[PDB]
Every structure is written in structure tokens, then in C-alpha cells.
Design a protein around this nucleic acid. Structure first.
Ligand SMILES: c1cc(Nc2ccc(NC3=NCCN3)cc2)ccc1NC1=NCCN1
Ligand SMILES: c1cc(Nc2ccc(NC3=NCCN3)cc2)ccc1NC1=NCCN1
Lengths: 248, 248
DNA sequence: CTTAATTC
DNA sequence: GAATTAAG
DNA sequence: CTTAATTC
DNA sequence: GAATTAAG
């Protein structure tokens, strides 16, 4: 049973993740950037009640923390919280787009490797810590009418909605899986941010490779979705494609 | 007095023109063209009364004649008659656009020739006969409530609104003024359909050249506007430009 | 909700 | 220039 | 007036 | 997709 032998690797049984080998991320700003404070547009009670449980969970997990920041961006009034970070994105220095587009990424999958395992990492961005000096950039307001917290909250992990999160996560995971690639020269490993494809020449190589990948991911602090996992199959769904016997 | 010595050349004193040296024009149709009969949109009495005098004059001049044709195009309901020949234009074979654009035409005016005469020919298109086989193409309806003519009328001369009239006229006049150019090698003659510019090196050459041009135009059957004529000047208006001492 | 594209 | 649409 | 472009 | 505009 894949789930039982790798408890630490699955999001269902290993608790929230944290990439312990990765230094907290520093987010450089453009040379002329100055903090921007966008007022929170009034949010209906319906929306606040819908969002509330999620904010509480994130606070309990330490992913969100109180703060006082010169920066402030809106949470969408219309549940799961979505922060409009466009004004912060505009002020952050650009980085080279290193994530390959799916078409090019899949071009590196040879017909020799037809046994596949597809894993997707749960709450991947939240596994990467944000350095305290960069945390203020992502603050937003949170008020609980019937006695709430300070005023603002911010993320201690790489947040959703930030323009560089996909690239920074893809780069971080590449650094953490570099050794795995070296130890398994005969396996193909495709990475598209939080979506992983492991390809082997035989069902055996795939089983052994998948065990090694799960163990490595778990030890590194990442968590894969056991519910969505596709293990050692000859046909899998990956990045919108149906991979079947070398096709696509 | 320029007007008195060349009575035949001016529209004011020579009567309507007729290019006697030019054979009646035959207008070739496209290979798949079939006659089109567009019904005349009702015309208000105000419009008909405004147009009436012009139709009568043209009939008296023989430029318009009664006819029965499979072709019919509209006269605009909203004075001076304007015929919508777009559907006829679409069915007429295209010819090469040989009239030079004003910019290029003026590029052939050297600074050596700074004495100018500008003439514009009155009702130029009407000076060119249309062959009877092509006359039917341009028919339109004309009804006079208080007892009128047959039903349709058509042109016996090159009409306004026809896509090839400017080009055909420019080509016809070029053929008629070819000899003049040969007899006056030291004069510059620019032709833009009905707008003519004669340039000479001295006021004398311009006077003599202008006399010769007027006499030639008159004999050929063309008529120039005495009212608008600009004779032997060092500054003239031509094709939207102010020609002054070699400039423009 | 707000901001910018793409359509109509 | 307003209706749809896409995306933070 | 009808037909097709260019703007908004 | 409607308002302006251009042209027969
Ligand atoms: C994709 C599809 C559409 N589709 C659309 C369909 C019908 C109408 N109909 C209409 N307009 C006026 C009257 N009636 C207008 C738009 C628009 C933008 C994006 N792409 C995109 N948006 C933001 C970023 N990228
Ligand atoms: C030249 C100029 C314009 N000018 C124009 C100005 C203001 C509006 N304003 C508006 N539209 C919608 C609401 N308000 C629309 C059009 C249009 C076509 C041509 N050119 C041309 N026509 C036929 C052939 N060539």
C-alpha cells in the first residue's frame, strides 16, 4: 500500500509541508518602488463568513500572521480568499521565466519510458518560507466585527497571486530534486511547478523510482496528493494530456 | 486680351466641348458580367425640381438621350444629379491606373521653368463620346409627373461617377496633346486629368506657349475655364499646391 | 471588486 | 463605447 | 439613399 | 454594434 509505506509524503497523512532545505525567500523590488496601500473594499458578511474558516486555519498553521505594514492589497469581496496582488506585482523586480511550457517539457519524454507516475504537490507555494523582510509586501486587512485581530495579516510563505510564485517554486523544487535525478540516471522526471511526471522503462523501475521519489519528497518537506496520485500506470493524465504508450 | 483672341478655347465663349479626334469609347465588361437593374428610390418633389433644369439642359445638349436598357442605376434622392454607378463599376473590366499622383507629377517640374499657366477644362468628361454599344450601361430612370419622357435616359458622353472616367480622359487628352509637346520641346506640360500646368523659362515663352495651348485645346474640342485661368504668373495654385519660384 | 483584453 | 470575459 | 470604412 | 464619415 503506497499510502501506508510513505505517510510523510502524502498531504493526507503527513501534515502541512515546509521545504526545510530552502532558505526563506527574499523578494527584490524594482529600483523606484515605494509601498502601496490599497484600501479594502467593503466585504459582505456572507463573504467574510465564507472566508473566515480559511483565515483561521492559516493563522493556526502559522502561514498567516498579524502585522503592521505600509503595504496593503485587497481580498476579493466575492468561499476561499483571493488576494489582488497586481499592484504589488507591478512593483516587484522581474525574473527570467524559467518554467518550460508543457509542450516543450513533454518533448523530453522518450518512447523508451512508457511506465508513468504522476504526482501533484498540495499547497506547494505554502511549503516555501518567505523571509521576514519580504513578508510586509503581501499584507491585507482582516477585521472580525465581533472582536477580531489587530488589523492586517500577511503571509510567512510564498503566496498565491504573486507573479513570481510559480517560477520560484519550480526553481526551488529543482534544487531539492537535483540529487534524486543524479541517483536515478535511468528515470525521466518532468517538473511543471507542482505537477510531476516520473517515467521508467519497466513497471519495476517505476515502482522503485516512485518509492524513492515519495520518500525524497516527504523528507524534503513536500506533500503530494494521495487522492489524485496516478502510480505506475501505462496511461496517465498530465498537464491536460493523456499520456498513453509514448503518444503525446 | 486672352479671352477675346481665343473664343473657341474658353467654356464661356466656345459652347460645349466635344473631342472630335477621339473615337467614341467602348467600355469592356468583366467576363462574367450581366446587366443589373437597380430600382430608382422614390425622390421627393424638392429634389426632382432641383435636378430637373440640369436634366433638361443635358437633354438639349444631346449629352443625355432617351433609351430602354437592361441596366439601371439610381440618381441620389438628396441640386445637381449624382448617379450611383457602383454596381456598374463592379461589372466593368479594370484598366491600369495611369494617372500619376500629384506628388510624382510635380516631380517633373524643373526650377529652370518658373513662369506658369494653369488651366482647368470644363466638363472634361462630357467632351469624350461614349460608343452607342456602351451607352446602355449607364441608364437611369427619369419621370416627370406632369407628362414626362419614356422612362430611362442615358449618357452619350463619358459620365461622372464611372470608375474609369478620370483615367480614360487623362489618356485621351494625352493623345490629343502629344503633337503640342513635340512642337514645344522647351515647355513643360503637366496633365492631371482636367487640370493643366504649362511651365516656361521666361514670361515671353509662357505667353507664346499659352497662346498655342489655348488654340490647340480649342481646335481639338476642349474648353478651359476663363474664370479660373491663371495666365503667365510667377505664382499659381495647382493641385492643392502654391507653386512659387520653383518651390513645390 | 477592480483592471485590462477582446468583442461587438 | 458598452457588453463579455479573464484574472488577481 | 445605399454601401462600406473608420471610430468609439 | 451603433455613431460618423466618405463617396457614388
Ligand atoms: C476572451 C473572450 C471574449 N468574448 C466576448 C464574447 C461576446 C461579446 N459581445 C458583446 N460586446 C459588446 C456587445 N456584445 C464580447 C466579448 C472577450 C475577452 C477575452 N480575453 C481576455 N479578457 C481579459 C484578458 N483576456
Ligand atoms: C474618416 C473619419 C471617421 N470619423 C469618426 C469620428 C467620431 C465617431 N464617433 C462615434 N462612433 C460611435 C459612437 N461615437 C465615429 C467616426 C470615420 C470614417 C472615415 N473614413 C471613411 N468612411 C467611409 C470610407 N472612408
Amino acid at each position: 500500500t503506497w499510502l501506508s509505506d510513505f505517510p510523510q509524503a502524502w498531504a493526507e497523512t503527513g501534515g502541512m509541508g515546509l521545504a526545510v532545505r530552502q532558505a526563506p525567500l527574499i523578494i527584490p523590488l524594482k529600483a523606484t518602488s515605494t509601498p502601496v496601500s490599497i484600501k479594502q473594499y467593503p466585504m459582505s458578511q456572507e463573504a467574510r463568513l465564507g472566508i473566515k474558516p480559511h483565515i483561521q486555519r492559516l493563522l493556526d498553521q502559522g502561514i498567516l500572521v498579524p502585522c503592521q505594514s505600509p503595504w496593503n492589497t485587497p481580498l476579493l469581496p466575492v468561499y476561499r480568499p483571493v488576494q489582488d496582488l497586481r499592484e504589488v506585482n507591478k512593483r516587484v523586480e522581474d525574473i527570467h521565466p524559467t518554467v518550460p511550457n508543457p509542450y516543450n517539457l513533454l518533448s523530453g519524454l522518450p518512447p523508451s519510458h512508457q511506465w508513468y507516475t504522476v504526482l501533484d504537490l498540495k499547497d506547494a507555494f505554502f511549503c516555501l518560507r518567505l523571509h521576514p523582510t519580504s513578508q510586509p509586501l503581501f499584507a491585507f486587512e482582516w477585521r472580525d466585527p465581533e472582536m477580531g485581530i489587530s488589523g492586517q495579516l500577511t503571509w510567512t510563505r510564498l503566496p498565491q497571486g504573486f507573479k513570481n510564485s510559480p517560477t520560484l517554486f519550480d526553481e526551488a523544487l529543482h534544487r531539492d530534486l537535483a540529487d534524486f535525478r543524479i541517483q536515478h540516471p535511468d528515470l525521466i522526471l518532468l517538473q511543471y511547478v507542482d505537477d510531476l511526471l516520473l517515467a521508467a522503462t519497466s513497471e519495476l523501475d517505476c515502482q522503485q523510482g516512485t518509492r524513492a521519489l515519495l520518500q525524497t519528497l516527504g523528507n524534503l518537506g513536500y506533500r503530494a496528493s494521495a487522492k489524485k496520485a496516478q502510480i505506475c500506470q501505462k496511461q496517465v493524465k498530465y498537464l491536460g494530456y493523456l499520456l498513453k504508450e509514448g503518444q503525446r
